[PDB]
RNA sequence: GAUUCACGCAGUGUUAACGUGCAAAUUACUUGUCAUAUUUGAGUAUAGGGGCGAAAGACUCAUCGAACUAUCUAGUAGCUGG
RNA sequence: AAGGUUCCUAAACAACAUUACUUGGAUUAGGGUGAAUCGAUCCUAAAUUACAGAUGGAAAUCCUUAAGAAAAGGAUUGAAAGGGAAUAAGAUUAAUAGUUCUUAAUCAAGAGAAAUGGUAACAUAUCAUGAACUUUAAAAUGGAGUGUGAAAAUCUACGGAAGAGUUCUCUUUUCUUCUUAACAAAAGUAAAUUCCACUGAAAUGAAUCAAUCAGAGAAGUGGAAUUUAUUGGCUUUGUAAGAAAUUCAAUGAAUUGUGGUAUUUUUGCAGUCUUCAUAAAAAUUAAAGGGAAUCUUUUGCUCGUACUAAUAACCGCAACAGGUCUCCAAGAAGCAAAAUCUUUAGUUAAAUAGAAUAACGCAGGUAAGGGAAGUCGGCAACAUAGCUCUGUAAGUUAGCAAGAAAGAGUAGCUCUGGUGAUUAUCGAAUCAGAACUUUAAAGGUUAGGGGAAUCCGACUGUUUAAUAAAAACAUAGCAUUCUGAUAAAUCUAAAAGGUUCAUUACAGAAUGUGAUUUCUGCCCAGUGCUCUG
RNA sequence: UUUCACUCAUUUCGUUAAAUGUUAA
């Protein structure tokens, strides 16, 4: 077995100091700097992880294509599909009831 | 399994028979599921001291420290309803 | 340390520069008593305290 | 490094004016046409000699062409 | 001798409050016209756990009635509140659990909580777990109402002092017996530095007035005047009585 | 273990070099110099420290400009 | 905040070694303990009739029943030495 | 971190490393630290400090956004372990290398009436306009335990190619090499979870090691999305064999398959348990609601970078058996990262040796017969010791005591049987049993002495650094006193001053006793405290 | 001198000093 060493000057097993040992030419092993695990977006109301958006760092969303950082729908990145259907029904039904109850009952 | 020490057998033999009895009633009621007032399911479990969450219903309810609804918290709710109806009627 | 400030590093280099002996020609001057530098130090003998 | 999948892209690449250098590597079972562009190093794995000769006629004459074999240059 | 532990407590050293993870100040919203002469509606977005206190906190969200935006408030939960509930704050609000009403509109016998000792000071009385104050009577002659404090004392407040109708959540917290010293250690995670209390009789005469001699005892009466200086005021202060109560 | 053993962990400087007096008397946590009293506008001098007055005062340095003025 | 082993840590016993020592408190075996009242690095806060103390008058740079350093100060001595 | 030139080389050995030294971390003279991508620099945490204001006889103190004609909203500092735009492989030097060279990349800042598809979940090499203002999310969140996906290491199956070791006794034999980066691509193909469409479950079904779920809709069928150390997880591909490794010849030549229902480590995922504990903020980024308006190329500055990191480079007067935070981690055997032995790497010197083999010693041992008669006292030493099976008392808070106590078995060799997968072939260590043999089997190493009572402390924990580790302190439990916040306790010389208090009687402050069970008797004269007098 | 009534110094507070008081609709 080949034993390795930290390449950067950090020497503690911190969250940002994650490393991976991979094999290289001649049987030698090198050290990579691996990336932290991130979370996605959550529905603004029900707090459910949205589908169709990757779980990457906040700045990497800028590198992604314009279509890969959201979903083509009403509110489309902040509310689940269920979160929005409730919003549409609430808007239409309450306005309709506010139209019949008052406003020339 | 056990004759009488049901949930407080994890305390072994080191807190007193009386104290282990008192803590048993509270620990049973704290860990049990309650009927959830908005969807009528045995799906409410405690998440913190005074916060209860309906697992299969998506609601967070404020309640007692260990029971979903306290005896004093139920009489007060009944009392206010009587007061509100009396105020609303003359 | 491996990591040091710029000003601190220059004061480290000067302490290195001042740890030298009397040049031979200065020792041949007429009426010369300065043969050895009594302000000298070595890393394992005295710590410069900086 | 990027890979060119079929023949139409590399010819259009060769006729494109962004090229910088060409190096041809002859392996035991294939021939690779590594076009050194400004940004990437496009390559094309070829196994048919006649298509390779067609490719070799397609390189502009002004371009420095490097021929690589079992001995590296 | 030395300065006793009670003297060292007022200096703001290690005895400072461990309030770093706390949610914030829990209180009513600032009074305005829409609360004095109307009702504003709030939405209980979530119910959270504030470290160091026994009652849950509701993250209520109001709407700004004079500008565009939101008024994110932080109330103390009344028992029975749930996520998505609408709560109305104002002088014309309905008498329901969780609504914020001036103490003059509550009928005699109403159970309220988070009462303001002075109008507009955003909540003083009846804030612990399971606590509440009852309304005793009204007096429209001088616009004052009487309430009964959780300690049993009676207090007279202005009739426009606000309050939340109901019972503070988290009742029955202190009926569960702590069993271990470790559990009591975790109780003061978000509190001040007080827990392991050395008996004064186990101290030395320099440290504490009780610091005894060849037998662990006090020596002098432990009931002391109110006017004793800081340093010798240790034990029972202005004790009208002692011994077990009958 | 109050003697030899306790001195193993002494690897954290309390004082670093000062900027006004040049000595290793700048307390890091206190953010003041124990010798020349830095931040303080006035140089720190005490009448009980009569020797510390003669170690650093007027005439113990170069006197780059005053030597011309007084001779003038 | 169950029983034990290990990396570690402490210091119950030998009242062993050493006792002008490896060491101004350490070594060997034995013993105990070895993750939640746990162990630990850095930063930060608390300073002299003050701090800090699960409390031994313990700790506060080998100094603590009141630190270190300088001035008053060549303090006074019916006492001891010359 | 600390040290500061101790790093490399050459000349030289007066001094120093308890002899010596041609050696040296010692003398003399030179050489040596290369960054757009690693860090500092940027942000904020505990906290810290300014102008004006407030306080003070004074020095100075308080306040940190409240007091201000100051700062859309609040000033400075505070992390080389928290947050954070972007780099890798090979080679190179006497010494530097995510820093130089070759090759190959990435990032930021610049320059040259406004789209489709899908029923839906949602998808489209930039595309396909999107201002003020507002909201949401990310950065950004405890711990335990169980299951499992993938990679690496070790082990192993089939087929080999090259080299090496053993060989008068055998051994188709034993050993080594057979590799691949950042960044991207998309032949082939996974595990887990969440949603969408059709349909409507009872004779209730679906499923996990455990759970858990369903008419606010299960199971089934067909889809969509996200995660799995870069693109998209694994094999594979470009980079890329031209490198590197193993051989051969004298620069040039050869090879570089496919698997495993095995162990460990790492990294994710899914649910379960637990809290009177709920387990950071900002810089910075994106989306949304609203509808105001009408590929090539340039540049990337400042600072650190050598070396030790310790039985010789740090702190203890020193080359001091003391102390000092981390990363990577092979084989045997075993439950075990234990003890013992070995491979890669390191070293054979680390305050001097030679001869003789007296006493008395320090360290490790054994001993006839007796077995604590020694001694203050079984102090020291001896003795038990793993695993399997049988068996296990009084007492008890009914949980324990309990590994109680006590007894038997265990080796080697040759066999037999049980526990599965794929549809006959393949595979795992685990358990049970039977003949035979002997020096009769845990014991090389590691490895509990047991029982009957009495006293104290309930327990886990802490304690006099350097003669006291305990019955002492803490503890949970019990009890008492004061206080409605402009308060109680309490710091300050003063203060729009400070602490509990981001608090509000289920709270804050002050005390005694110390788990549980049973019980707390009489006394208000004396001294305290109090009175609604 | 005591008991009253007020606020105007004074105290304690709250906010983005965001509809206070009296008429009007």
PDB file of N, CA, C and O in Angstrom, chain A residues 4-33:
ATOM      1  N   UNK A   4      -0.023   8.465   1.480  1.00  0.00           N
ATOM      2  CA  UNK A   4      -0.020   9.764   0.816  1.00  0.00           C
ATOM      3  C   UNK A   4       0.174  10.892   1.819  1.00  0.00           C
ATOM      4  O   UNK A   4       0.302  10.658   3.025  1.00  0.00           O
ATOM      5  N   UNK A   5       0.210  12.126   1.318  1.00  0.00           N
ATOM      6  CA  UNK A   5       0.393  13.314   2.134  1.00  0.00           C
ATOM      7  C   UNK A   5      -0.523  14.415   1.623  1.00  0.00           C
ATOM      8  O   UNK A   5      -0.851  14.463   0.436  1.00  0.00           O
ATOM      9  N   UNK A   6      -0.933  15.300   2.528  1.00  0.00           N
ATOM     10  CA  UNK A   6      -1.693  16.474   2.128  1.00  0.00           C
ATOM     11  C   UNK A   6      -0.863  17.336   1.186  1.00  0.00           C
ATOM     12  O   UNK A   6       0.318  17.593   1.435  1.00  0.00           O
ATOM     13  N   UNK A   7      -1.483  17.793   0.105  1.00  0.00           N
ATOM     14  CA  UNK A   7      -0.774  18.630  -0.858  1.00  0.00           C
ATOM     15  C   UNK A   7      -0.831  20.100  -0.467  1.00  0.00           C
ATOM     16  O   UNK A   7       0.166  20.815  -0.582  1.00  0.00           O
ATOM     17  N   UNK A   8      -1.982  20.576  -0.008  1.00  0.00           N
ATOM     18  CA  UNK A   8      -2.081  21.931   0.502  1.00  0.00           C
ATOM     19  C   UNK A   8      -1.555  21.984   1.933  1.00  0.00           C
ATOM     20  O   UNK A   8      -1.219  20.964   2.540  1.00  0.00           O
ATOM     21  N   UNK A   9      -1.481  23.193   2.479  1.00  0.00           N
ATOM     22  CA  UNK A   9      -0.897  23.381   3.800  1.00  0.00           C
ATOM     23  C   UNK A   9      -1.883  23.150   4.935  1.00  0.00           C
ATOM     24  O   UNK A   9      -1.471  23.168   6.098  1.00  0.00           O
ATOM     25  N   UNK A  10      -3.160  22.945   4.635  1.00  0.00           N
ATOM     26  CA  UNK A  10      -4.107  22.552   5.667  1.00  0.00           C
ATOM     27  C   UNK A  10      -3.806  21.135   6.133  1.00  0.00           C
ATOM     28  O   UNK A  10      -3.505  20.253   5.326  1.00  0.00           O
ATOM     29  N   UNK A  11      -3.893  20.915   7.445  1.00  0.00           N
ATOM     30  CA  UNK A  11      -3.497  19.639   8.027  1.00  0.00           C
ATOM     31  C   UNK A  11      -4.551  19.079   8.972  1.00  0.00           C
ATOM     32  O   UNK A  11      -4.234  18.221   9.799  1.00  0.00           O
ATOM     33  N   UNK A  12      -5.792  19.539   8.871  1.00  0.00           N
ATOM     34  CA  UNK A  12      -6.855  19.089   9.753  1.00  0.00           C
ATOM     35  C   UNK A  12      -8.039  18.622   8.923  1.00  0.00           C
ATOM     36  O   UNK A  12      -8.309  19.156   7.845  1.00  0.00           O
ATOM     37  N   UNK A  13      -8.744  17.614   9.435  1.00  0.00           N
ATOM     38  CA  UNK A  13      -9.819  16.956   8.695  1.00  0.00           C
ATOM     39  C   UNK A  13     -11.102  17.790   8.740  1.00  0.00           C
ATOM     40  O   UNK A  13     -12.163  17.346   9.174  1.00  0.00           O
ATOM     41  N   UNK A  14     -10.984  19.022   8.263  1.00  0.00           N
ATOM     42  CA  UNK A  14     -12.083  19.970   8.291  1.00  0.00           C
ATOM     43  C   UNK A  14     -13.057  19.671   7.148  1.00  0.00           C
ATOM     44  O   UNK A  14     -12.777  18.870   6.253  1.00  0.00           O
ATOM     45  N   UNK A  15     -14.227  20.314   7.192  1.00  0.00           N
ATOM     46  CA  UNK A  15     -15.242  20.086   6.169  1.00  0.00           C
ATOM     47  C   UNK A  15     -14.758  20.524   4.794  1.00  0.00           C
ATOM     48  O   UNK A  15     -15.047  19.865   3.789  1.00  0.00           O
ATOM     49  N   UNK A  16     -14.034  21.639   4.723  1.00  0.00           N
ATOM     50  CA  UNK A  16     -13.499  22.096   3.449  1.00  0.00           C
ATOM     51  C   UNK A  16     -12.199  21.403   3.073  1.00  0.00           C
ATOM     52  O   UNK A  16     -11.717  21.594   1.953  1.00  0.00           O
ATOM     53  N   UNK A  17     -11.625  20.605   3.972  1.00  0.00           N
ATOM     54  CA  UNK A  17     -10.380  19.894   3.719  1.00  0.00           C
ATOM     55  C   UNK A  17     -10.615  18.438   3.335  1.00  0.00           C
ATOM     56  O   UNK A  17      -9.832  17.561   3.711  1.00  0.00           O
ATOM     57  N   UNK A  18     -11.691  18.158   2.608  1.00  0.00           N
ATOM     58  CA  UNK A  18     -11.921  16.805   2.144  1.00  0.00           C
ATOM     59  C   UNK A  18     -10.951  16.440   1.036  1.00  0.00           C
ATOM     60  O   UNK A  18     -10.625  17.254   0.171  1.00  0.00           O
ATOM     61  N   UNK A  19     -10.477  15.198   1.070  1.00  0.00           N
ATOM     62  CA  UNK A  19      -9.534  14.699   0.080  1.00  0.00           C
ATOM     63  C   UNK A  19      -9.991  13.338  -0.417  1.00  0.00           C
ATOM     64  O   UNK A  19     -10.706  12.607   0.273  1.00  0.00           O
ATOM     65  N   UNK A  20      -9.571  13.007  -1.634  1.00  0.00           N
ATOM     66  CA  UNK A  20      -9.759  11.685  -2.206  1.00  0.00           C
ATOM     67  C   UNK A  20      -8.417  11.178  -2.707  1.00  0.00           C
ATOM     68  O   UNK A  20      -7.641  11.937  -3.293  1.00  0.00           O
ATOM     69  N   UNK A  21      -8.145   9.902  -2.471  1.00  0.00           N
ATOM     70  CA  UNK A  21      -6.922   9.259  -2.933  1.00  0.00           C
ATOM     71  C   UNK A  21      -7.254   8.457  -4.181  1.00  0.00           C
ATOM     72  O   UNK A  21      -8.057   7.518  -4.130  1.00  0.00           O
ATOM     73  N   UNK A  22      -6.640   8.819  -5.304  1.00  0.00           N
ATOM     74  CA  UNK A  22      -6.860   8.129  -6.565  1.00  0.00           C
ATOM     75  C   UNK A  22      -5.527   7.604  -7.076  1.00  0.00           C
ATOM     76  O   UNK A  22      -4.458   8.124  -6.750  1.00  0.00           O
ATOM     77  N   UNK A  23      -5.604   6.555  -7.886  1.00  0.00           N
ATOM     78  CA  UNK A  23      -4.412   5.941  -8.445  1.00  0.00           C
ATOM     79  C   UNK A  23      -3.953   6.703  -9.682  1.00  0.00           C
ATOM     80  O   UNK A  23      -4.737   7.368 -10.362  1.00  0.00           O
ATOM     81  N   UNK A  24      -2.657   6.603  -9.968  1.00  0.00           N
ATOM     82  CA  UNK A  24      -2.047   7.319 -11.076  1.00  0.00           C
ATOM     83  C   UNK A  24      -1.040   6.391 -11.747  1.00  0.00           C
ATOM     84  O   UNK A  24      -0.959   5.200 -11.433  1.00  0.00           O
ATOM     85  N   UNK A  25      -0.273   6.938 -12.688  1.00  0.00           N
ATOM     86  CA  UNK A  25       0.661   6.133 -13.462  1.00  0.00           C
ATOM     87  C   UNK A  25       1.755   5.557 -12.576  1.00  0.00           C
ATOM     88  O   UNK A  25       2.320   6.249 -11.726  1.00  0.00           O
ATOM     89  N   UNK A  26       2.061   4.280 -12.789  1.00  0.00           N
ATOM     90  CA  UNK A  26       3.106   3.614 -12.042  1.00  0.00           C
ATOM     91  C   UNK A  26       2.694   3.067 -10.696  1.00  0.00           C
ATOM     92  O   UNK A  26       3.560   2.612  -9.942  1.00  0.00           O
ATOM     93  N   UNK A  27       1.407   3.097 -10.366  1.00  0.00           N
ATOM     94  CA  UNK A  27       0.940   2.644  -9.076  1.00  0.00           C
ATOM     95  C   UNK A  27       0.954   3.694  -7.988  1.00  0.00           C
ATOM     96  O   UNK A  27       0.491   3.414  -6.876  1.00  0.00           O
ATOM     97  N   UNK A  28       1.470   4.888  -8.267  1.00  0.00           N
ATOM     98  CA  UNK A  28       1.451   5.958  -7.285  1.00  0.00           C
ATOM     99  C   UNK A  28       0.032   6.464  -7.072  1.00  0.00           C
ATOM    100  O   UNK A  28      -0.812   6.413  -7.969  1.00  0.00           O
ATOM    101  N   UNK A  29      -0.224   6.957  -5.868  1.00  0.00           N
ATOM    102  CA  UNK A  29      -1.511   7.526  -5.506  1.00  0.00           C
ATOM    103  C   UNK A  29      -1.356   9.018  -5.266  1.00  0.00           C
ATOM    104  O   UNK A  29      -0.397   9.456  -4.623  1.00  0.00           O
ATOM    105  N   UNK A  30      -2.295   9.797  -5.787  1.00  0.00           N
ATOM    106  CA  UNK A  30      -2.303  11.239  -5.609  1.00  0.00           C
ATOM    107  C   UNK A  30      -3.543  11.650  -4.829  1.00  0.00           C
ATOM    108  O   UNK A  30      -4.474  10.867  -4.635  1.00  0.00           O
ATOM    109  N   UNK A  31      -3.547  12.901  -4.379  1.00  0.00           N
ATOM    110  CA  UNK A  31      -4.596  13.434  -3.519  1.00  0.00           C
ATOM    111  C   UNK A  31      -5.372  14.486  -4.296  1.00  0.00           C
ATOM    112  O   UNK A  31      -4.782  15.420  -4.851  1.00  0.00           O
ATOM    113  N   UNK A  32      -6.690  14.330  -4.341  1.00  0.00           N
ATOM    114  CA  UNK A  32      -7.591  15.303  -4.934  1.00  0.00           C
ATOM    115  C   UNK A  32      -8.329  16.049  -3.835  1.00  0.00           C
ATOM    116  O   UNK A  32      -8.489  15.552  -2.720  1.00  0.00           O
ATOM    117  N   UNK A  33      -8.780  17.255  -4.157  1.00  0.00           N
ATOM    118  CA  UNK A  33      -9.606  18.045  -3.253  1.00  0.00           C
ATOM    119  C   UNK A  33     -11.058  17.894  -3.687  1.00  0.00           C
ATOM    120  O   UNK A  33     -11.462  18.442  -4.717  1.00  0.00           O
TER     121      UNK A  33
END
